[PDB]
Amino acid sequence: GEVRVPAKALWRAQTQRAVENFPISGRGLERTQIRALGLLKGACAQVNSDLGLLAPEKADAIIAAAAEIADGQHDDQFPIDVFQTGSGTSSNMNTNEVIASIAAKGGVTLHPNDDVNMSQSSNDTFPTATHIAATEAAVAHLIPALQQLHDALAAKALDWHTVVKSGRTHLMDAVPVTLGQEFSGYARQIEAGIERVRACLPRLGELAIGGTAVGTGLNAPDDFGVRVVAVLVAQTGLSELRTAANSFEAQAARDGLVEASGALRTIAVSLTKIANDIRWMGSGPLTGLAEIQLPDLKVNPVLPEAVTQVAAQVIGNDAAIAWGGANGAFELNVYIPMMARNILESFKLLTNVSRLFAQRCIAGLTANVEHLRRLAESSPSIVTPLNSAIGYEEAAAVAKQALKERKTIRQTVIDRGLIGDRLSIEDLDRRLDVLAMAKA
Amino acid sequence: NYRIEHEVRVPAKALWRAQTQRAVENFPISGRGLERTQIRALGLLKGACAQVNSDLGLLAPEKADAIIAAAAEIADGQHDDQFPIDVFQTGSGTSSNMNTNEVIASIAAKGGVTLHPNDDVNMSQSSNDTFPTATHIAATEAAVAHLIPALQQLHDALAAKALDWHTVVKSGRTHLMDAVPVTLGQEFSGYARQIEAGIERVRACLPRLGELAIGGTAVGTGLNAPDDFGVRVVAVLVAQTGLSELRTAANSFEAQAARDGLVEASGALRTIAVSLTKIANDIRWMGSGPLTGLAEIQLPDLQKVNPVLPEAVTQVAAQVIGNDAAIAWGGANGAFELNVYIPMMARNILESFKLLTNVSRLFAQRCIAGLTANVEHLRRLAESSPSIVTPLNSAIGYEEAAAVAKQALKERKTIRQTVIDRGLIGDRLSIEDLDRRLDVLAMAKAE
Amino acid sequence: YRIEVRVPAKALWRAQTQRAVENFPISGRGLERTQIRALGLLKGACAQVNSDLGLLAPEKADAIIAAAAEIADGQHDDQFPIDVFQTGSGTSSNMNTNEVIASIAAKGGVTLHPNDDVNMSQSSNDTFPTATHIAATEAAVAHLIPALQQLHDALAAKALDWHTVVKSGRTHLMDAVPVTLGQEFSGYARQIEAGIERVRACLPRLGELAIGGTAVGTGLNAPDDFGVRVVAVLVAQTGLSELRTAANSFEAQAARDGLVEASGALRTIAVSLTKIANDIRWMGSGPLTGLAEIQLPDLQPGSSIMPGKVNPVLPEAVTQVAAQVIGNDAAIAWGGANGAFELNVYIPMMARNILESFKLLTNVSRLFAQRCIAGLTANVEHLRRLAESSPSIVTPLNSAIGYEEAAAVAKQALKERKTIRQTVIDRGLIGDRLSIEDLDRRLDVLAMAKAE
Amino acid sequence: NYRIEHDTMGEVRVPAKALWRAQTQRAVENFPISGRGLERTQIRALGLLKGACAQVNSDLGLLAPEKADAIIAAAAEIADGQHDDQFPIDVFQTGSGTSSNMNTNEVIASIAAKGGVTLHPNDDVNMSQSSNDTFPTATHIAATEAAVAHLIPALQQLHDALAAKALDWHTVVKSGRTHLMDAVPVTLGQEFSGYARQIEAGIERVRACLPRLGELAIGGTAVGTGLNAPDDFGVRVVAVLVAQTGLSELRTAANSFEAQAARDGLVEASGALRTIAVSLTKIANDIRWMGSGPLTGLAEIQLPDLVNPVLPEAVTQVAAQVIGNDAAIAWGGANGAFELNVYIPMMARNILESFKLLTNVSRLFAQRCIAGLTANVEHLRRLAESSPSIVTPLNSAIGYEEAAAVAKQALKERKTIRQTVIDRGLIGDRLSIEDLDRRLDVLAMAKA
Ligand SMILES: COc1ccc(S(=O)(=O)N2CCCCCC2)cc1NC(=O)Cc1n[nH]c(=O)c2ccccc12
Ligand SMILES: COc1ccc(S(=O)(=O)N2CCCCCC2)cc1NC(=O)Cc1n[nH]c(=O)c2ccccc12
Ligand SMILES: [Cl-]
Ligand SMILES: [Cl-]
Ligand SMILES: [Cl-]
Ligand SMILES: [Cl-]
Ligand SMILES: [Cl-]
């Protein structure tokens, strides 16, 4: 039919039809997705050239246009809604048409399908770009952001190694701990988060390229996949990219995204705990716990709120990803654009809020040392450290009398006239010292 | 060009000011800000508040008119690009509240009127009762003015097909296996009811979705606001918008300590997403083929035909389900006098409303309306199914009925032709008695 | 062990049930008492109607009704061994009920055919979802709503008792202007009251029964009015007026959207309960290192290592129940979306989850009301002291001494740990623009909470 | 019919025959919520842990040898399943699992008393322990054992059944399906190789979570600090557990505070199970669709009758349950505070159920569905040979327009592409039979 296309638009007919067919969310591909589609087209053009299937002049043109796209020079040339044909074929064609128009600016005539989509199908390209984008997000961005947060938490764990305070279990007063020990716990949660992301990489980095329409590789060179992956690894430095173990699994399912989402969700769960504890420690200053002071951006914990909200989003996104993941049929899972949107957003949210959390909250925390000490000196104590001085039986009697008369262990020892040759006052304070009780 | 404020650097053509710019620098998290409906509702709210402060003599009429004019521009969508703050901001949404106050002041300034963002545009209000008020305004309007009419359009399209296909007999399917006859019209009457029930579900949540916190100020007590600020602002909002569903909260503390009304409404959207998944799935399966699939109907071409709108629908449904999980999560985790997950909740609920509205109209117009049934083929299959030999039992015994069914399937013939081919027509069974027993439309029991 | 297939001797079920037992050894958990009861109610009403329409012999119908009444009464809850994770229509549990009823009638000398007699006018597809919705409707009206009303009433009572118990508000977990403990609990009460409203609003669709639609929704091989007749009997016998024939017989079998809808209501209540329970254990936190606003009744020892430590175990039970309801809700929506054509085949899993959510919420709400809320005591003097020392209450001084001096009062009081009243005095601001009488009027914290 | 018992809170009436005591009975009355208690595997883990603890306490000279022996013997009876009816406490108990810990202590004491040995539930049976490190330890022992000894071998059985079908059906060519629409040829073998990979990847996912799932909190006592335990109590107890269970995946926690303030390892493991549920949903759905009919469906295969696809229905319902449980687990996981996460019994219920359901349904799926599948081989090939999707390799010979006409006529007349090309008289000018049979070899097209 007749198709009206904007003057300064590098996309063509089929992209414009897709724009008209899916006015649903008003939001299109992110920069990372666009970049990954550009990287893939350049790599495909390179391999088609190396195999003598594509004329060198045409290949050079594609590679040049693809490089512009991957460098972010055309992020306004991808107007198709996220909620499109579930294979992502519309965005694939979007990329083919934009490259064709760019090449035409350089006096080379490309056919979007026959040249720019050579050896590819409408079904193995978009999930490939999706996993490229997800792997890049995991390796180049999320993991270093998490490492930064870990290092900030670990720094406080060391700095506060002897800042004694009261433990809390069930929200109730418990035996002493140090602020440093608590932050050593938070740091380990983030460290384990990094371990979780790393563990999913062998399957997250699997690319479907080469499988063409249904996974068989019909109408592609037998080694298209492995050659394209090699160019991608060389150009991105992403050694985690690899050919799929099974070309049918790689298109019929998107289980790699579901798996990876689970790692992000676990991280969201840890971050909720860490953020929650931190805003509670900062609460008050009169009606709260008043354990620490957060940097001001009466200070509201705005970054913990940002963190806990991001975590909520990752959990919602995770549910959406799994839902689409389960609902593939036969040779193709047709939930890819929705799954891509959600997994890449979860990566982006976690990355950016972890860095903000680290730099503008954690690094600048100040402990209220004297208040914390007074809290520790209000914790329950135990009789065990008195055994080698008064014996198991007298200790047991002290514990019973303390419980009965609702007095501290220390005062009960004094009231029972136990301060003598077997136990001086100094010896009592040493054995019951709250920092020693924390076993730091 | 960038103008300077105090020190913070603000874009020249930006109508926001220093507090918004600081929020921009503090939350570079998603790169996504408030949606159009939330911005519109913030405008609506600020205008109504100014009207009431003017009515109560608390704000100069010249200042009030400036806010009202500015706010109207915002509510009309003229300033959507003036709200740069990330969704993932302070959990009260105070940053976006100040964004609105600042943009209104800057709009007024161009008209020669000076407004203090806090002292004037935020008069009688707090950082805590305004943003969720705007959220519930935006959600109520999305439910009443957009989603319900969209759903009604879908219902009517499905109902129209159910009528057109009233006598289009086909094989029923249970457990995906062949079963006794139904009509395509009956199936589509079921789809229509699912959507109709969806509308009932949305309507049922409105008494609580429409509750507004405005007037409760910082903690719910209404301290530093007129005692009747809430009912006055709501009456102005209703008067201006026609949204009679908007109401003052039943309890002012519940309305700020929790966002339970959004959790409730999301559940209604989630159920609709569940209904749409079933409908969309059946339709793309019915259209599967053209050779190795079910080949019951043909879908209209768009991009044989891929079912691209059922894929759009089932992907939207997945998103609504994910959004629903995030909303419940934020909803459960308020503390004492304030739930601090509102911007995240607003984002997700308003998007869910939008996606369902837009994809339902698309589904109705560009998929449902142009569906075409393979009528003769559907009847042929129904008339050849082993599932329909049971009315033959009283005439020929279930053992011979079984032989008929097995031979019909093997030779790919109707049950009728098989009965005839096996020489069963006689005094035990006339051809007219056979056609009565095997009347597959009558078996469907269409009203 | 009798033989038919080896079947336990004291088993009232027969061969088809025993086959299902051997086919689905998956969870080791079978139907609940409420589902069993509902299957009993339905079979008895069906025989009643079949008899009335002259389709079933009176002696046979009487034997079904008598046997089905024993099942509904809970006398045979050990005769339903089939796993929850069975054929997705629930046909196996339907046959279970048919077989057990036939065996009961056999003890009385009457021979019933499980299919031809007990399952007359019914199919293996409209029975189990009918029983599920009967069970879910009963759980909503007879058990959950009264239990929520009991918790509502306990919260409302506390709100009344604590109407003048002033304290500092908390927003973002930071100090805020005064509220009363009573206002907060009126807020919790409203959340529970709204929860009841949410359950009530789903009942028009939760109560829809598929019975009469037979195999595919068409009503083939059943009387045309079978559905309305069975429902009439059920409503008369159970008093459950919310039970009704489905608006659309195809929707009622192709989907279980009413269950998804109802779970949404339950999920929302779980969300409310989470907020309420969290606030309450935080309010009782400490007693020396926490908020120490209230004291929860002691229910059991908390720690071996810490002998006097008593933990908020009911709020912990409530919040864990809430997590379960949210999990169950996701399972129900998952099952609900994935029907195909004429039948949703996730009914037993959806039934398990919705009925569990009803049960857990019902039971934990009553325990929460009786063993926690009713016995709460407020630390009134503690709460009032913090309120009277709060920087947040200096605002009403503005019109007398100016906001800059009020800010100074707040800073000094906060630093010298004094009340706002005493700090105003210690700065010598009581003169001819401000009496001690006017000061106490302006710093009346209860009046600042504006309690009605 | 009762006897009097007591704790630090006062006196409590207990059923006369019951092996539990006061604190258990308080919890019986405090939490009548679900009506369901700990599972066999949980009780076993608690028994194993208590025995190991008594062994270490005896080794370190902290507990009298005659007392340790009485504990170890009692704990063995519990771990073997002789006293499961003595664990009446609801899943929905105190969030630390305090009550079930005391349950185990009390029952061990009452058992030993029958042997003439007097044990204090707290002082002897709970020596060097607290609830806060024992109940999550038992929970992670149960989950680790469920992963290693049960789930992975069940998945390997399912993988092997799917891989056997992939081998058997290696040349069973059929029409591909994308968007539910006919596509270029594949084989049943290839589809099933895809299913096998999903389950193989599932095993990889479970194995990848084990370094953290296997972490045990034991030794951290009340708040993570180890107060009131020997400094090496944890490593010693873990060594005993590893020796007695053969589970090398059991290990001390990398950080003692993380191990009690959080249950992130359970959230992580649930993610793997959830992913498996997602894979199983795809496989089960495909298989019931392939078996659909016998007239109006796809009718690609026939499922064994045990014909409704009842095992795929059991599989997809189990999947839904696992996804549901997964949401409950993450919810509890996120909501710890300071030194302790208090959602452990609920998280344990859900993670352990998810392990159990996937284990049992995978073995059933493998044995009683996958193994007995039969393919309609000739019919599949005939459809593949008759599909408009395979006319494309004729384009260069007969042209686009004629290829479309061939496709349309073949469908309308229900004939193969090969026969339609012949019938339209295209052999001779356009191409030979040899060329036709080469271009339309659907098996070669499937690249198999
Ligand atoms: C999706 O399903 C189809 C797609 C296309 C065509 S066709 O009309 O194009 N066709 C019929 C002409 C004889 C050559 C086979 C191809 C037919 C069917 N369906 C059937 O053939 C049903 C059937 N009937 N009888 C049997 O014995 C049987 C045995 C195994 C599998 C299926 C069947
Ligand atoms: C599930 O799908 C089937 C089930 C059973 C049988 S059967 O083998 O039992 N059969 C074929 C013999 C002629 C009488 C129809 C019944 C066939 C099909 N499939 C087809 O007939 C495919 C088909 N082929 N060609 C067309 O032109 C057409 C037009 C509309 C719809 C479908 C088609
Ligand atoms: Cl443009
Ligand atoms: Cl701008
Ligand atoms: Cl029995
Ligand atoms: Cl039972
Ligand atoms: Cl009614």
Coordinates of all heavy atoms in Angstrom, one line a residue, chain B residues 173 290-296 298 374 377 380-381 384 409 412-413, chain D residues 295-298 379 410-414, ligand 2:
Chain B
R173 N -13.5 -28.9 22.9 CA -12.2 -29.4 23.3 C -12.0 -29.3 24.8 O -12.1 -28.1 25.3 CB -11.0 -28.6 22.6 CG -10.6 -29.2 21.3 CD -9.4 -28.5 20.8 NE -9.3 -28.6 19.4 CZ -9.8 -27.8 18.5 NH1 -10.5 -26.7 19.0 NH2 -9.7 -28.0 17.2
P290 N -1.5 -22.8 8.1 CA -2.8 -23.2 7.6 C -3.0 -24.7 7.4 O -4.1 -25.2 7.1 CB -2.9 -22.5 6.3 CG -1.5 -22.5 5.8 CD -0.6 -22.4 7.0
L291 N -1.9 -25.5 7.5 CA -2.0 -27.0 7.3 C -1.9 -27.9 8.5 O -2.8 -28.7 8.7 CB -0.9 -27.4 6.3 CG -0.9 -28.9 6.0 CD1 -2.1 -29.3 5.2 CD2 0.4 -29.3 5.2
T292 N -0.9 -27.7 9.3 CA -0.7 -28.6 10.4 C -1.3 -28.2 11.8 O -1.2 -28.9 12.8 CB 0.8 -28.8 10.6 OG1 1.4 -27.7 11.3 CG2 1.5 -29.0 9.3
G293 N -2.0 -27.1 11.8 CA -2.6 -26.6 13.0 C -4.1 -26.8 13.0 O -4.6 -27.7 12.3
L294 N -4.8 -26.1 13.8 CA -6.3 -26.3 14.0 C -7.1 -25.7 12.8 O -8.1 -26.3 12.5 CB -6.7 -25.6 15.3 CG -6.1 -26.1 16.6 CD1 -6.9 -25.5 17.8 CD2 -6.0 -27.6 16.7
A295 N -6.6 -24.6 12.2 CA -7.2 -24.0 11.1 C -8.7 -23.9 11.2 O -9.5 -24.1 10.3 CB -6.9 -24.8 9.8
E296 N -9.2 -23.4 12.4 CA -10.6 -23.1 12.6 C -11.0 -21.8 12.1 O -12.1 -21.6 11.6 CB -10.9 -23.2 14.1 CG -10.8 -24.6 14.7 CD -11.4 -24.8 16.1 OE1 -11.8 -23.7 16.7 OE2 -11.4 -25.9 16.6
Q298 N -9.5 -17.6 10.5 CA -8.3 -16.9 9.9 C -8.3 -15.5 10.5 O -9.3 -14.8 10.6 CB -8.4 -16.8 8.4 CG -8.6 -18.2 7.7 CD -8.6 -18.1 6.2 OE1 -9.3 -17.2 5.6 NE2 -8.0 -19.0 5.6
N374 N -13.8 -20.8 9.2 CA -13.9 -21.9 8.2 C -15.2 -22.7 8.5 O -15.0 -23.8 9.0 CB -12.7 -22.7 8.2 CG -11.5 -21.9 7.7 OD1 -11.6 -21.1 6.8 ND2 -10.3 -22.2 8.3
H377 N -15.8 -26.4 7.0 CA -14.8 -27.3 7.6 C -15.0 -27.6 9.0 O -14.9 -28.8 9.4 CB -13.4 -26.6 7.4 CG -12.2 -27.4 7.9 ND1 -11.7 -28.5 7.3 CD2 -11.5 -27.3 9.0 CE1 -10.7 -29.0 8.0 NE2 -10.6 -28.3 9.1
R380 N -17.8 -30.1 9.2 CA -17.3 -31.3 8.7 C -16.6 -32.1 9.8 O -16.9 -33.3 10.0 CB -16.4 -31.1 7.5 CG -16.4 -32.2 6.4 CD -15.7 -33.5 6.9 NE -15.7 -34.5 5.9 CZ -15.3 -35.7 6.1 NH1 -14.8 -36.1 7.3 NH2 -15.3 -36.6 5.1
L381 N -15.7 -31.5 10.5 CA -15.0 -32.1 11.6 C -15.9 -32.5 12.7 O -15.8 -33.7 13.3 CB -13.9 -31.2 12.1 CG -12.8 -30.9 11.2 CD1 -11.7 -30.0 11.8 CD2 -12.2 -32.2 10.7
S384 N -17.7 -35.6 12.0 CA -16.9 -36.8 11.8 C -16.2 -37.3 13.1 O -15.4 -38.2 13.1 CB -15.8 -36.5 10.8 OG -16.3 -35.9 9.6
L409 N -12.9 -42.5 11.7 CA -11.6 -41.8 11.9 C -10.6 -42.3 10.9 O -9.8 -41.5 10.3 CB -11.1 -42.0 13.3 CG -9.9 -41.2 13.8 CD1 -10.1 -39.7 13.6 CD2 -9.6 -41.6 15.2
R412 N -11.4 -41.2 7.4 CA -11.6 -39.8 7.3 C -13.0 -39.4 6.7 O -13.1 -38.7 5.7 CB -10.5 -39.1 6.6 CG -9.2 -39.1 7.4 CD -8.0 -38.6 6.6 NE -6.8 -38.5 7.4 CZ -5.9 -39.4 7.6 NH1 -6.0 -40.6 7.0 NH2 -4.8 -39.2 8.3
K413 N -14.1 -40.0 7.2 CA -15.4 -39.8 6.8 C -16.3 -39.3 7.9 O -15.9 -39.4 9.1 CB -16.0 -41.1 6.2 CG -15.5 -41.6 4.9 CD -16.2 -42.9 4.5 CE -16.1 -43.2 3.0 NZ -14.8 -43.7 2.6
Chain D
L295 N -9.0 -36.2 16.3 CA -9.5 -35.8 15.0 C -9.2 -34.3 14.8 O -8.6 -33.9 13.7 CB -11.0 -36.0 14.8 CG -11.5 -35.4 13.5 CD1 -11.0 -36.2 12.3 CD2 -13.1 -35.4 13.5
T296 N -9.6 -33.4 15.7 CA -9.5 -32.0 15.5 C -8.2 -31.3 16.0 O -8.1 -30.1 15.8 CB -10.7 -31.3 16.1 OG1 -10.6 -31.2 17.5 CG2 -12.0 -32.0 15.7
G297 N -7.3 -32.1 16.6 CA -6.1 -31.5 17.1 C -4.9 -31.7 16.2 O -5.0 -32.0 15.0
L298 N -3.7 -31.6 16.7 CA -2.5 -31.7 15.9 C -2.2 -33.2 15.6 O -1.6 -33.5 14.5 CB -1.3 -31.1 16.7 CG -1.5 -29.6 17.1 CD1 -0.2 -29.1 17.7 CD2 -2.0 -28.8 16.0
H379 N 2.4 -39.9 9.0 CA 1.5 -38.8 8.9 C 2.2 -37.5 9.1 O 2.0 -36.5 8.4 CB 0.4 -38.9 10.0 CG -0.6 -37.8 10.1 ND1 -1.5 -37.5 9.1 CD2 -0.7 -36.8 11.0 CE1 -2.2 -36.4 9.4 NE2 -1.7 -36.0 10.6
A410 N -1.7 -27.1 -3.6 CA -1.4 -28.2 -2.7 C -2.2 -28.3 -1.5 O -2.7 -29.3 -1.0 CB 0.1 -28.2 -2.3
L411 N -2.4 -27.1 -0.8 CA -3.2 -27.0 0.3 C -4.7 -27.2 0.0 O -5.4 -28.0 0.7 CB -3.1 -25.6 0.9 CG -3.9 -25.2 2.2 CD1 -3.4 -26.2 3.3 CD2 -3.6 -23.8 2.6
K412 N -5.2 -26.6 -1.1 CA -6.6 -26.8 -1.5 C -6.9 -28.2 -1.8 O -8.0 -28.7 -1.5 CB -6.9 -25.9 -2.7 CG -8.3 -26.0 -3.2 CD -8.5 -25.4 -4.6 CE -9.3 -24.1 -4.6 NZ -10.7 -24.4 -4.3
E413 N -6.0 -29.0 -2.4 CA -6.3 -30.3 -2.9 C -5.8 -31.4 -1.9 O -6.0 -32.6 -2.1 CB -5.6 -30.6 -4.3 CG -6.0 -29.6 -5.3 CD -7.5 -29.7 -5.7 OE1 -8.1 -30.7 -5.4 OE2 -8.0 -28.8 -6.4
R414 N -5.2 -30.9 -0.8 CA -4.6 -31.8 0.2 C -3.6 -32.8 -0.4 O -3.7 -34.0 -0.2 CB -5.7 -32.5 1.0 CG -6.5 -31.5 1.9 CD -7.7 -32.2 2.5 NE -8.3 -31.3 3.5 CZ -9.2 -30.4 3.1 NH1 -9.6 -30.2 1.9 NH2 -9.8 -29.6 4.1
Ligands
LIG2 C1 -7.0 -30.4 12.5 O1 -7.1 -30.3 11.1 C2 -7.7 -31.4 10.5 C3 -8.3 -32.4 11.1 C4 -8.9 -33.5 10.4 C5 -8.8 -33.6 9.0 S1 -9.3 -34.9 8.1 O2 -8.1 -35.5 7.6 O3 -10.1 -35.7 9.0 N1 -10.1 -34.3 6.9 C6 -9.6 -34.2 5.6 C7 -10.4 -34.9 4.5 C8 -11.4 -34.0 3.9 C9 -12.5 -33.6 4.9 C10 -12.0 -32.8 6.1 C11 -11.5 -33.7 7.2 C12 -8.2 -32.5 8.3 C13 -7.6 -31.4 9.0 N2 -6.9 -30.4 8.3 C14 -7.2 -29.8 7.1 O4 -8.2 -30.2 6.4 C15 -6.3 -28.7 6.5 C16 -6.8 -28.0 5.4 N3 -6.4 -28.4 4.2 N4 -6.8 -27.7 3.1 C17 -7.8 -26.7 3.1 O5 -8.1 -26.2 2.0 C18 -8.3 -26.3 4.4 C19 -9.3 -25.3 4.5 C20 -9.7 -24.9 5.8 C21 -9.2 -25.5 6.9 C22 -8.3 -26.6 6.8 C23 -7.8 -26.9 5.6

